[PDB]
Design a protein around this motif. Sequence first.
Motif, short mmCIF file in Angstrom:
data_model
loop_
_atom_site.label_atom_id
_atom_site.label_comp_id
_atom_site.label_asym_id
_atom_site.label_seq_id
_atom_site.Cartn_x
_atom_site.Cartn_y
_atom_site.Cartn_z
N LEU A 83 0.83 -1.19 0.00
CA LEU A 83 0.00 0.00 0.00
C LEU A 83 0.88 1.25 0.00
O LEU A 83 1.56 1.54 0.99
CB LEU A 83 -0.91 -0.03 1.22
CG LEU A 83 -1.93 1.11 1.37
CD1 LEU A 83 -2.83 1.20 0.13
CD2 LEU A 83 -2.75 0.89 2.64
N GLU A 84 0.88 1.97 -1.12
CA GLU A 84 1.74 3.16 -1.28
C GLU A 84 1.03 4.44 -0.86
O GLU A 84 1.64 5.35 -0.30
CB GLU A 84 2.16 3.34 -2.74
CG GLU A 84 3.16 2.34 -3.27
CD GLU A 84 3.73 2.78 -4.61
OE1 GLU A 84 3.03 3.52 -5.35
OE2 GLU A 84 4.88 2.41 -4.91
N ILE A 85 -0.26 4.53 -1.18
CA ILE A 85 -1.05 5.72 -0.90
C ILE A 85 -2.39 5.31 -0.30
O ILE A 85 -3.08 4.45 -0.83
CB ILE A 85 -1.33 6.53 -2.19
CG1 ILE A 85 -0.03 6.86 -2.93
CG2 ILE A 85 -2.11 7.80 -1.85
CD1 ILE A 85 -0.24 7.28 -4.37
N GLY A 94 -3.31 3.89 -3.68
CA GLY A 94 -2.23 3.55 -4.58
C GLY A 94 -1.53 2.30 -4.10
O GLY A 94 -1.24 2.17 -2.91
N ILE A 95 -1.25 1.39 -5.03
CA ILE A 95 -0.64 0.11 -4.68
C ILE A 95 0.48 -0.21 -5.66
O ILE A 95 0.40 0.15 -6.83
CB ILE A 95 -1.71 -1.03 -4.71
CG1 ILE A 95 -2.79 -0.75 -3.66
CG2 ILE A 95 -1.09 -2.39 -4.49
CD1 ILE A 95 -4.04 -1.60 -3.82
N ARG A 96 1.51 -0.91 -5.19
CA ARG A 96 2.55 -1.43 -6.06
C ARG A 96 2.66 -2.94 -5.88
O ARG A 96 2.63 -3.44 -4.77
CB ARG A 96 3.90 -0.77 -5.80
CG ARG A 96 5.02 -1.32 -6.68
CD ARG A 96 6.35 -0.59 -6.46
NE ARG A 96 6.86 -0.73 -5.10
CZ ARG A 96 7.71 -1.68 -4.71
NH1 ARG A 96 8.14 -2.59 -5.57
NH2 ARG A 96 8.11 -1.72 -3.45
N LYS A 105 5.44 -7.05 -14.15
CA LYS A 105 6.51 -6.58 -13.28
C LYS A 105 6.48 -5.08 -13.07
O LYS A 105 6.20 -4.32 -14.00
CB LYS A 105 7.88 -6.99 -13.83
CG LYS A 105 8.34 -8.39 -13.40
CD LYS A 105 9.79 -8.33 -12.96
CE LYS A 105 10.01 -7.18 -11.97
NZ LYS A 105 11.41 -6.69 -11.96
N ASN A 106 6.78 -4.65 -11.85
CA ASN A 106 6.81 -3.23 -11.51
C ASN A 106 5.50 -2.54 -11.85
O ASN A 106 5.48 -1.40 -12.30
CB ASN A 106 7.99 -2.52 -12.18
CG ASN A 106 9.32 -2.99 -11.62
OD1 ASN A 106 9.44 -3.24 -10.43
ND2 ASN A 106 10.31 -3.14 -12.49
N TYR A 107 4.41 -3.25 -11.61
CA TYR A 107 3.08 -2.69 -11.75
C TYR A 107 2.70 -1.81 -10.56
O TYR A 107 2.83 -2.22 -9.42
CB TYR A 107 2.05 -3.82 -11.87
CG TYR A 107 0.63 -3.33 -12.05
CD1 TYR A 107 0.10 -3.16 -13.32
CD2 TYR A 107 -0.17 -3.03 -10.95
CE1 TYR A 107 -1.18 -2.70 -13.49
CE2 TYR A 107 -1.47 -2.58 -11.12
CZ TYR A 107 -1.97 -2.41 -12.40
OH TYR A 107 -3.26 -1.96 -12.59
#
Length: 171
Positions: A83-85, A94-96, A105-107
């Motif tokens: 969880l980024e944001i 926002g998620i990575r 990859k790197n989604y």
Amino acid sequence: ESEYIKKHHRHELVESQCSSTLVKHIKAPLHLVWSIVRRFDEPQKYKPFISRCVVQGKKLEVGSVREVDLKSGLPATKSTEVLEILDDNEHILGIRIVGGDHRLKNYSSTISLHSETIDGKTGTLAIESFVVDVPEGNTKEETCFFVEALIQCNLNSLADVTERLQAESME
């Protein structure tokens, strides 16, 4: 519209990345839609290709990690995501994807929600963007099409789930 909201959305920075933005008009109030979207621990409430989700603890915060089970039609395929944001003021999630049994990859993705009126009825505009690496052997278009399809499905499902929840809370 908002520089602040804009900067949290995703965009391609290099040639081997792909990014796009999809929108969905949802006939349900923002507080209801956000109550579903913000649940980083329960994506399966509306994402059709996720069957289950494990987070450690119950308090969602930046840096929370989840492991989701993907409905891939193969045995035991997983995705680990951070969880980024989590902005409860501006309604931005926002998620990575950190790893998993993935092609993607790197989604990273960002969804934001905004009140909107259509036909005199106040609902919710969902905006979802992503950026992802284009895999070795893929064309950009192949990757973009796939991801755009997934997000379209997720947004259509979000709309159906929240519109049904809204109707159930009128009865």
